Amino acid sequence: KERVVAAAEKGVLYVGSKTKEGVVHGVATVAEKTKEQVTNVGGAVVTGVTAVAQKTVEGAGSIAAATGFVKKDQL
């Protein structure tokens, strides 16, 4: 009776050569969370799907993916 489903069915030179490099392809979740509670106080709470597909994050002191990150640096 009750049914839930998720389907994701699908100098440098490239001479006649296929490349995919950085790429998120298939993410099926079908999540179910009854009676969910979240109480964040000055932090970071992540309870969902995330798909980061960066290719170049060149840079000193940088951050590529800052999920659920809590940065409290001092001096």
Write the layout of secondary structure elements.
Elements: no helix or strand
Give an overview of the whole structure.
- Sequence repeats lie at residues 17-31, 32-42.
- One of its GO terms (molecular function) is oxidoreductase activity.
- Belongs to the synuclein family.
- It comes from Homo sapiens (Human).
- The modification Phosphoserine is found at residue 62.
- The protein has 75 residues and is mostly loops.
- Helix content is 0%, strand content 0%.
- The protein has no helices and no strands.
- The termini are far apart.
Shape: flat
Beta-strand percentage range: under 5%
Give the distance, in angstroms, between the N- and C-terminal Cα atoms: 59 Å
Helical content stands at under 10%
Question: What class, by secondary structure content?
Answer: little secondary structure
Query: Mind telling me the C-alpha Rg?
Result: 19 Å
Number of helices, where a helix is a run of at least 4 consecutive DSSP H or I residues: 0
Largest sheet: none
- Per DSSP E runs of 2 or more residues, the count of β-strands stands at 0
PDB class: protein fibril
Keywords: Alpha-Synuclein, G14R Mutation, Fibrils, Cryo-EM, Protein Aggregation, Amyloid Structure, protein fibril
Assembly: monomeric
Entry title: In vitro grown G14R Alpha-Synuclein Fibrils
